[PDB]
Amino acid sequence: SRDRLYTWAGLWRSPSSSWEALRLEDDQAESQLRAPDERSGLPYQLDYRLRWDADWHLREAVFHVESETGVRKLHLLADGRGHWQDGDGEALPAFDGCLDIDIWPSPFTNTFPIRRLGLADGQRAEIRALYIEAPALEPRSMRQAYTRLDASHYLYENLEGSAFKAVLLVDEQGLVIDYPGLFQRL
Amino acid sequence: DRLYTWAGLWRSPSSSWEALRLEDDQAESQLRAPDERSGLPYQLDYRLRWDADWHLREAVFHVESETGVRKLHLLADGRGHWQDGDGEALPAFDGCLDIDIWPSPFTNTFPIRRLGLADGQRAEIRALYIEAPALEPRSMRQAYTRLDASHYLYENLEGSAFKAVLLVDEQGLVIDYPGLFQRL
């Protein structure tokens, strides 16, 4: 009654991408990510917080996305041993075996397998990642591989059929500097 | 606590999304859009307040982008005399009665509601044009023509010759800005 909402979408288009600002503590991160919906062409903002254990196993994830379609939330709990549940404590068996989350579009999440696995040069690991693509935030299990090439370079590969592969340049804490052609640290 | 910022290198076509809350004498809006040079997103929050004649009296802007936070606070007397939030006079904007914000069709409402044009009637205005994300205002010559109650011809008078026909609702709020904005 006090006010009335009016919403406008632009019809003009310009090329655009993501911008993410993250704050990192020892056992948790909080981030604000802004990016275009790649189907609709309209912007969204994703706010999220991740919390992990001493061994860099994910224990909690909270997401809040705002877009033209409305506000969507997601709350996930993980036991650090591959068992997931929602914020209501309902088990999510479809994610069994996932130890790490991978959020698109964010190169933050590549840090988890790096820090968790502690790979040596030349060592390869195949993982089951819980892949969550903004803005829809509908998680699904995804097979991935990481190979340590040297201290600052990791070979990332999709294992589900795309054959996508990339070499990540990371810093001494395992944070991505360059995700070549996809993300740059500012 | 360590701060980390990443820019995307991938590109996808994008545009503005604006959600505005309107009251009798003021509006507060949240506008998200891409920077048209950098490819990176920004968010503009703004609030406008006007008198009963639809003359702008105050405007406050807050933009967040990869370049940082930028703020702008304008005061107008409704008679074409402007000041910043600290009271310092802004002679460069002398004679402006209306603000025009890009990218927003909201601000087309001001001349429509203020001018009281008859059907077929054209008026030139001096608009204070404020383009996000930089928010560096400048006076600009524009013209409005009432075609009928629900259609106004907009003209840029600075030399582009850009013209548009705006479809508006019963309160002068833009429904269609053809090829630029659509009401959802």
Numbering used by the authors:
A (entry chain A): 2 to 187
B (entry chain B): 4 to 187
From the paper:
The crystal structure of PA1994 from Pseudomonas aeruginosa, a member of the Pfam PF06475 family classified as a domain of unknown function (DUF1089), reveals a novel fold comprising a 15-stranded β-sheet wrapped around a single α-helix that assembles into a tight dimeric arrangement. The remote structural similarity to lipoprotein localization factors, in addition to the presence of an acidic pocket that is conserved in DUF1089 homologs, phospholipid-binding and sugar-binding proteins, indicate a role for PA1994 and the DUF1089 family in glycolipid metabolism. Genome-context analysis lends further support to the involvement of this family of proteins in glycolipid metabolism and indicates possible activation of DUF1089 homologs under conditions of bacterial cell-wall stress or host–pathogen interactions. The PA1994 gene of Pseudomonas aeruginosa, an opportunistic human pathogen, encodes a protein with a molecular weight of 21.6 kDa (residues 1–187) and a calculated isoelectric point of 4.9.
